[PDB]
Symmetry: D2
Subunit: 293 residues, 4 copies
């Protein structure tokens, strides 16, 4: 079982990547037991980044670790190809792409051709990043088998049978769930792990749930799952992708800068309200010895 | 954890409930280890049954077992009230209702009042039957808490975090998933069991997956899960609610008659095509000693 | 260019059809210039009515007028067949059915077979009642052509090209829009009329918009269209199907009884709030000489 | 009322904007009666263009006409701001933006702030480009009123009451429908015109339908509407955004190059089947003297 963090991209006030804060964050995640870092995913505002910026993020995290999956996709296939080729000089886990987003009613043949083109140019294993609520497209287990060249899939969906279908139809594929329900996906149900959307700000909780689940301490894991879920709900009040910055600073104790507008930062009042909603959870996690005081 | 079968309603060729086939089927399910029978659910074509027929189903299954959850809902609240009251004389597990279907944009206040009215008249525990893809409405954990009178919920959805939310917000509620992914939901993830949509025709597989999962024989449970999933996929070719009849006859060895049009019966060609698609699965299950040749 | 009213079903406090109030309402609508009355549609709570109740509604309206389309559909095809046959003794415009509702993932073959069965037994022209938001199914122009036996379609959808497609692919079919935008569908865009959701409580507005639109007085019709839309929006505050009763009493001056729970009646305070929301609209309609005070 | 064409962006075989084919196309549309050109819309593959390419498109079309609405939106607000400011030196009709796409569950507050920011820096009138099926967001008449700074809206949706709501709640706003049903939106329903997604390849049909409609000749307008609809249905066989290139070449007689992958071009065989599907429609339009 592995935990993959879709790592946040810190931006400066000038709306450029803050490489030093990114390095600090990646170092903390690896130190806290995260297995692999997924760079330029939704949580990292991948679609908001130019190709150059996607490459910047890779370079900053690569200084720290090579346990990286490098998301390269976009609506200009030539740029995705150029990022795939540029990744050759990095001894990472793989590259990845979401399906082409925005445009409705794209044919299956064109979607398959997009992914097969990336596979044909990739110097690394290729991972499917399936995120239907954001892309409008589902690249399901059958289409993945037709594409035929994925080493793995990250299925960011709450429909857990949909994720298991990949393993059934592609027994050699590494299959990761992005379900919020870590207990039922990270270990012992047929999958290889979880792409954990809350692991940026509470990697200790994610990692401990994984351990407890592997030990079958389900009641103990549930208690932590529920605290995790309360933080997720609180993060949705003002926008989860923006709230992730405030929560990482609060729980992990270092600043992660700003998101990129139109993913606007929480304003002062929103930040204080969000902290009020989670300060009792922090206290409980300290009592449980999950977090340090 | 417990397995709940949403039991099929067998109809005769002239569209009457076949009470004797229903009793044979109910007896087989209990004998094969199903814990409880859910009567007049989607799988039982509940919405296609008059209130008089819904009661007729209860009476037939009650001749076999009292481990019944009696679905009574509909768009005439007086009929649902009458069925709830008629159930006083039956020593059953509970009554249940789906949310009012068909009408779009029903107010939360009116949905809450519908369920609270049933609770006020029920002589038994009341179960929420949540089936958003059919009713067009979701009665989520928060609305369930507001209603405040459910003894349990059957959450027929693949979104497993949605199901866990009921247990987090309502710790005393019995919470059952209708996910196809038995191996995750039946045991060891904090729910009370599974409403197993495929357990009419392969109760042995459902019950064995549960046993293997509880024993931590996950590789063995997975092989059976996949066989189950292949059958579910084949059932979708011609329509699962109709295919359920052919599959029960094939795997369990007794006739269950016909569905009720517009849930049309598979014709003979469709029956033969479906059987060809699953006969290798049957042979595998015989080899595995799950079924008898 | 015809206006069709999907007529309300008035119920008594005892939750039975109020035949006398239905007769008075039907008489008023015809007297105010509505062309045809559509009985047992969504606005009439069709799916909440037993087959016998659907037939009662036909009889009560038929005493008044033979300008009826009789909705007979449901989830027991035998009952819909019964009703179709029972209509033979009524010299009405046609019968109608929505598609089978509730059950998801019904095959095109089965949906086609449902409607072809009704056509085979019908003693009257058969009309498609297309309401995808309520039924979960779209019987579009292509499927209607495949069914091949509809005399007309009522397309209750805001997608106006969807409605025109029926006329393009079925040039001999009568095609009515259920769009809220009367001005654009009641005349001069290739359709045969509108099924007017608000014509129960303001038939005068509906009929006046029709005449103004034919007389090429689009500025005048727009003003009334806007007042009509403001009333529609106010009806959604507490639930449109319930608010339609209060609005008919307020604008037309006679009582229409109660809806059938779970379509709950507005309580006395909700009624007061709704009337305040439309008080100024009534005054404007009186000033414009469309309603007598 | 007006016809607005969301103009195609022609690309070369090596995936560069073909400025000289774009100018040929723009000049033809204007010559055939199109009122305004909407640049970097969905049909122009706006989200597939860098901000630098979005400006390139403006500069090329501006060589032909100033009757331009310049779409500048994207997921880096600083780039949209730059494009809005760069537009100052172009004497055009307005700028436009779609709502931020991709990210789900964006708050109304953040959506409003995005548009109000563009309004604060824009040297031209600002148009809302509402396309819920592509962006996942609906900026409806109520939210547009709250934003309060739109000169106009292009509502790319088949729900015609949704579009009229903008005029009811914002009486001074210019309101255009992107409905396929031209004959109901190009005149006599309270709207200011139509953003016509088939007008790239059959501008004659769009403009003639508008004329006939205004002239109350609804029977003849309907016959053209149906032919237009048959071509649109054919365009969906292999992909509408890709098929629009083949159809423009076939009906207008000049080459428009290629789309940008993953909007892949039709292959030679796909092109032949599409042409076979519409060849009878072309002959009919010629007979009717719509085409020559």
């Amino acid at each position: 079982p592995e935990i993959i963090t879709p790592i946040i991209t810190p931006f400066t006030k000038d709306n450029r990547i803050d490489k030093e804060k990114l390095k600090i964050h990646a170092e903390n995640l690896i130190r806290k037991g995260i297995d692999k870092l997924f760079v330029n995913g939704t949580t990292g505002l991948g679609p908001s980044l130019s190709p150059e910026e996607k490459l910047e993020n890779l370079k900053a995290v690569y200084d720290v670790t090579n346990k990286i999956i490098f998301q390269v996709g976009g609506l200009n296939l030539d740029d995705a190809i150029r990022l795939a080729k540029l990744s050759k000089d990095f001894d990472i886990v793989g590259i990845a792409s979401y399906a082409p987003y925005y445009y409705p009613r794209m044919s299956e043949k064109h979607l398959v051709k997009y992914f097969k083109t990336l596979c044909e140019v990739s110097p690394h294993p290729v991972y499917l990043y399936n995120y239907p609520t954001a892309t409008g497209k589902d690249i399901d287990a059958k289409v993945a088998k037709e594409i035929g060249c994925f080493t793995g899939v990250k299925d960011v969906i709450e429909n857990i049978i949909h994720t298991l279908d990949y393993k059934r139809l592609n027994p050699n594929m590494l299959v990761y769930s992005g379900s919020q329900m870590l207990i039922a996906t990270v270990a012992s149900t047929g999958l290889d792990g979880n792409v954990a959307l809350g692991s940026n700000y509470l990697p200790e909780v994610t990692v401990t749930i994984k351990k407890l689940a592997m030990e079958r301490k389900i009641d103990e894991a549930l208690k932590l799952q529920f605290l995790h879920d309360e933080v997720i709900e609180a993060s949705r009040i003002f926008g989860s992708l923006s709230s992730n910055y405030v929560l990482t600073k609060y729980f992990q104790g270092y600043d992660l800068g700003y998101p990129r507008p139109p993913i606007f930062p929480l304003d002062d009042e929103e930040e204080r309200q969000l902290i009020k909603k989670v300060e009792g959870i922090r206290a409980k996690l300290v009592e449980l010895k999950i977090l340090k005081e």
